[PDB]
Amino acid sequence: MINEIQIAAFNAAYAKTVDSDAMEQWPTFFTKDCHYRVTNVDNHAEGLAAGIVWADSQDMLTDRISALREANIYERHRYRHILGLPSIQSGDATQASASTPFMVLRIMHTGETEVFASGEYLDKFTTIDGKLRLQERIAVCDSTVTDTLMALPL
Amino acid sequence: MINEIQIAAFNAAYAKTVDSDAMEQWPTFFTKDCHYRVTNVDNHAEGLAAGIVWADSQDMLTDRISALREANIYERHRYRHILGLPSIQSGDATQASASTPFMVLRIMHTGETEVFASGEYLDKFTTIDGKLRLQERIAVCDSTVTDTLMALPL
Amino acid sequence: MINEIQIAAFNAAYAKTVDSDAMEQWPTFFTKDCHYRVTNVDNHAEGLAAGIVWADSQDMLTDRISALREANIYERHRYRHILGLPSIQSGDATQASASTPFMVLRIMHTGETEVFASGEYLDKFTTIDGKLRLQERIAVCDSTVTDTLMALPL
Amino acid sequence: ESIIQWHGATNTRVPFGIYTDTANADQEQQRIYRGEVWNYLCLESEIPGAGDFRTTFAGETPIVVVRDADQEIYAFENRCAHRGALIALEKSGRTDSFQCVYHAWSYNRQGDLTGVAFEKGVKGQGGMPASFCKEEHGPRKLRVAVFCGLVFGSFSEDVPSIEDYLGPEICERIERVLHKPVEVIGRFTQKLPNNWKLYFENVKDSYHASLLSQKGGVIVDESGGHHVSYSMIRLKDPSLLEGFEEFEDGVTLQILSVFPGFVLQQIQNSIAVRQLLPKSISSSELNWTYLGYADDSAEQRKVRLKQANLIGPAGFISMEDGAVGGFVQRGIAGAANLDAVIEMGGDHEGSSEGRATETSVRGFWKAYRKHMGQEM
Amino acid sequence: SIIQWHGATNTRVPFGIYTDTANADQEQQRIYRGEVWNYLCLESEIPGAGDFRTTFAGETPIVVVRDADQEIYAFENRCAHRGALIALEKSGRTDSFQCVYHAWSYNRQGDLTGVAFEKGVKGQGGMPASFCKEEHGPRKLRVAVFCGLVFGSFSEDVPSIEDYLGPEICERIERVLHKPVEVIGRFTQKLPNNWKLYFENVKDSYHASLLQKGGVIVDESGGHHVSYSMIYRLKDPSLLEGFEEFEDGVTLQILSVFPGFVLQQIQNSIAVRQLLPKSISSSELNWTYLGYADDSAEQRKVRLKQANLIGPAGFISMEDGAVGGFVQRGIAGAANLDAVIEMGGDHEGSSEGRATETSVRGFWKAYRKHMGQE
Amino acid sequence: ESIIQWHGATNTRVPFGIYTDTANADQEQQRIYRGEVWNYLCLESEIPGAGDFRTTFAGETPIVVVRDADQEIYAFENRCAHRGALIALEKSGRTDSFQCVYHAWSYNRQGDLTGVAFEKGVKGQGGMPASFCKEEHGPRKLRVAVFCGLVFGSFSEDVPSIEDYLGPEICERIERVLHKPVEVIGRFTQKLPNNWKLYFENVKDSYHASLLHMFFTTFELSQKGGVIVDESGGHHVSYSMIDRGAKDRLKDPSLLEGFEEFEDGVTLQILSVFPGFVLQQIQNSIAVRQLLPKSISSSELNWTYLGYADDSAEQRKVRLKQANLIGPAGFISMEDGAVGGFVQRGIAGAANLDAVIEMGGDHEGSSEGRATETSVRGFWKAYRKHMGQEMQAENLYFQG
Amino acid sequence: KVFGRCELAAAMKRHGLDNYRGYSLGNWVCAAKFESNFNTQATNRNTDGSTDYGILQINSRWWCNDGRTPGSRNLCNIPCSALLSSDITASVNCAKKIVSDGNGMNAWVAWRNRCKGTDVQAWIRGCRL
Ligand code: FES
Ligand code: FES
Ligand code: FES
């Protein structure tokens, strides 16, 4: 069984990876055939499918990070993830669905600290060759507003 | 023994209930003859008894939510609860006294995200039909200031 | 093995000590010949050793708190520590190296709440008489900016 | 170009610019808060003994209020006469004298400079010139007035007595409630996203309040500035409204206001005071002081604690009071050149038997224009 | 004066134009509530009778609503009593609107239909005999619908949307909004810059070309433009795997309408933007992502993948959020200096090149006209 | 109604409106920061090699400062001469040339426009008109001066030399401390809730500093002190010193366990240079501060903590312990962050009143002892000179 | 986990299922015997697209959410995976909600067919209780 302890540990490592700018390790958390999306409560409530980020393969995650490094120009900043306890919604002997509250601070190189996003990760977990992985993560943001831009994924 | 994990899980379900606007489930977290109070550290330090919310029955909690639905007018917003680890002061297999740090973000429908309240829950837990319930929860807020108004309880 | 749960519990007690202004208990969390430093990611990346706070003995921590009580002038305020899950890098039954994300709110007596600092504690833990102590804690702040001043340690 | 152009002499029309013009706000500081008004400071029971002090505001201007050995209460501007630092840094305490921490200038409880660190130099080096005299430097002192446990402060020598300022009808309505020693049972502050005037209008808005077998009425003092709104003879836990008799009339609701920011309220057994302070053109602060009587029994106090759910930031009755100001602030964003319409109950700025009127609102603006030199 | 224009030409913009707060208040009375069409929403976002949304025309909040006649109306969101917002919701469906403060009722045209206690209570108080409901009301807006785009004006004197747009931009809108569209997402960006900096950037072909055959068209007023374009490795090239659906070769068409409407087509990515001013140095950008109602599953998936090109995290548009701020901050010591806009000459008309700033100079031709700054 | 009304030609009275008037702040930008002053930019050792650059500010105005192959240091305004974007987006880096990200205009390390994307059109279409010349467009370049490794910049060619600006007494007091190669040992920034002027006055407030130092030796050798002021009033030195070779609480006393390393008795030396530079020596604690304005009621203080390159392990440890005296949590300097704010807030209803600055008389020159405000009055002598706020024409006619 | 008969009796008693809504401890032990054979991991796919989970074979269309079952009502507000732990807490709490629904223990088919009105109390004899 996938449990709350395993997802907690997974969530802390995901957070550290994104917050440390080790972004090349970020796709490793997902299955080959995964879905990742950044949206908001309005879109999620009305059934609207589009994301600020929208990926249906681990490869698309890898491309997003290539483009961040090679192509995208943005002012230096870092994230600080504060996560709540994962709460398992559904599961059988092998799969599990969960929700994890999140808050993401954005710290500019110039020192300004802002609550940049908050919401929950709606996740589908599987456990393949002894590794816990995201089949799906939807970052459902509480706000319809993103300040300036979104460079790094949530 | 009631432990920190069981309280943490209880706290996350309380939080999800309030943050998801499932407000009708909120009184179910309390005993019939419970106490709930929103106050601040100034009032708590003097021994001043008044609350922004003050309830000595589950029925009072139920009426507060009826009035929120039927009567009270306020601009749409939601809460995002970020909770700390509970610290247990005393407890046996059935009762426990504990303090839990909290932070509450307020997200307006217009998208503004603000730290709306922070403090600790001073709690008294009992066990009813083998489940945790609050005999008492005092939301001791760090700030004497509430922005605009308080519609949803903490 | 020293584990994530034991460090989390230690971290919540440390936080409560600092947030409750029981600052005289703060040095008791450290070994006699400990290191404590408040710095930032820029200094930490360039290998720069200086701290806003810098201590290489528990006695220096005790003196910092004497001076807070008996010497320093500052406008009343309190801290609210919100902590993430520890990640252990290395460790046996008695030593452990770990990183713990943190956010500190500052609440002024006049009621303003602000994100005052965020980052991670780079910790070295040891075990004395079966209890966890900090041999080393480096509060690596995400921001190069401190608002107004720093009276209380992180 | 002037958005503070009044339509007529009547007060049925308020220019929406009055809630936006920053120059006009600075005039409100000079002409209202530091003019011929009484500013509510605190309760006498909050500073019972000698040296007991609080800090607060009269408009933008920070204030110290303190009890002395003579049992009298004094107030002075919280500004060091040296280089201008706040003198008292704490909300409340007890002190023998005040001291500015920057360069250790000492002030007595009247606000007199009693001490200057190194006034006479250090080893016959530097210090003040021979010509410097402590008694010639000091914060502006306030006139203090007391009424049934309410402490007020004014900057004006010319301001009338508190009894004359309030008038007899408001004096009686206050004494009705505050006839005994009161005890603070809680404090809460609301930060309102609106110009102060919008919240004070709202306190006086009997039209609004009536929307949320009893007859009511609205009293207005001769100046227009002070009002009383009164009323007189489903829930799973009806105990919320289970009250007890303690006024020798039938009055179940009395909301009383005093220009420019004081409220006393009685709603069944729920007693409270409010202080309204301006903070910025589009923000204000509301400080609640919840009250019992010192002689209350356990059971009587419990009733006030339950009935408090009616009032304050989450009040069944008062919740919306926090937001409506903001709704106006935002609705007028493109209409700084237009006028609010205030015709309910005629042109009248005196008392009425109805509550479907705006007489107490027009009263506010009669008093405002008088103090601001805006009549015609 | 930091809003002193150097000459009649528009090759030089005073940097004070992005900073002067008095000048911003003039923009409210002369542009947003002047002779312009403000974009409000899509007709398909309020399909049924009573369906309403709230937004803004400059600083001024607006209600837009469908009535039983299937027509769309719009009025200022201001109670004619003491000025409170009337409608408090982003969107909803109602028979009539009511101000929560004192329960004044408005119909879907913005007419005052009801005044709580108008005639007193027990013949006590109420309105004077002289008070007449039909003399009080929020400002109503002239509404125009063009290919589903709902626009509002405060001005009786403003030309029709067809005359305002002109024929070249009318055709360029019809090109992409030729069929029923379906909203597939909304996202808002808070821009740390004066609105004008982002609208300039939409029109900046010089910038966009840096980031084969193309052109730039400008209406007669200068205010509206169209930029158009035609023909390390990706582990998943499916991001750019498109499908043909325009009768020309055009793979990029970015269209702007003074003072804050954008329609874009980038391969199969369709979207609308609404640009609102918020403070001297902040603006709001509202994205409405679109499919066509007749899209297959596979065609829709393509638009969902290609959306990664646009919005707050867009491979293409990410920088668009920040460049305005870069200028706002670069000019912090230079309120008294002038931007240099000479690419493609003095010209404010259409061009075959994209190494030009003609559409940018056009913005300022239109701006100075509305502001009386010639 | 002018809340910028000076009482007389003396500086014993400061109008509190000087800390509030926004038009007056914009004048400070034109007349002080971009006028005949030297703005502190960085240490030469912070950009040691060719291409090494940092970004900072002179008042409101962002600045690039960079080392070139010639081993000289240049500085220019961080504003693209096109449509005004920041050129360099990084706190620090190393580059061959600078490039505006908006439309790829290239700048050399002097701040010269060396390149315009599509200058000559694409297929003989568009581009710049024949009349356009690269050399006629560019960010404002700053005159640079390097004094004991301190890099300063001015926008004025006419500004006096750094030596004449500083004067000889301040030149020597800087050389005293920066006599050897220094090494940066940490950086910290404070956001101050006060007008810049309040913090700079506080640096120069020997009355405050002596009061506090006198309090600090209720805890744990006879000292004399003094206050030097340059001829302009703008620069000061506050010092305290023992007489080397006279006769006659802490659980870890190591905090104050120091070592001798100047050929004098000076225990404390705080040096200021108009309008926002501080060099400090407190025992073995060496540091530089850069004060920038941000908003009418906000300012930024940037600390650069220093060691000497030749420090042994034990000597460096001493400076790391003694750093506890300074910065945002300093035993000495903690309150320096808040007192500015206490004034900003105390004067909220007193914009039309005047600060009283009479300690040590009217004078704006050097003094024995520290119970004086001569260095504060000096600040305002310098300020009024730069701002054209000496007695005007009409008011001079009436008095004479 | 396979429980011993008496182990499971003791765990059900310490969770207060003795006389819970009419039903003596033996009913609960007998029910688990014939539902799961005292196997906390017992798992039974139904042709209706639903599954029965854990020691009391609780159905995934009504009671717990397994993510696989069209029309999940999830009336115990738990994922079905919590009914497959070594620990019977979540299984008992959902049971208490099921037996309270007021079809009593008839909800457990195997309890009707094999337990109802037998000598129930037999499942508890020979146990440290
Ligand atoms: S400002 Fe108060 S003593 Fe100097
Ligand atoms: S403001 Fe709308 S009813 Fe009063
Ligand atoms: S703004 Fe720098 S190249 Fe255009």
Ligand SMILES: [Fe+3]
């Ligand atoms: Fe672009």
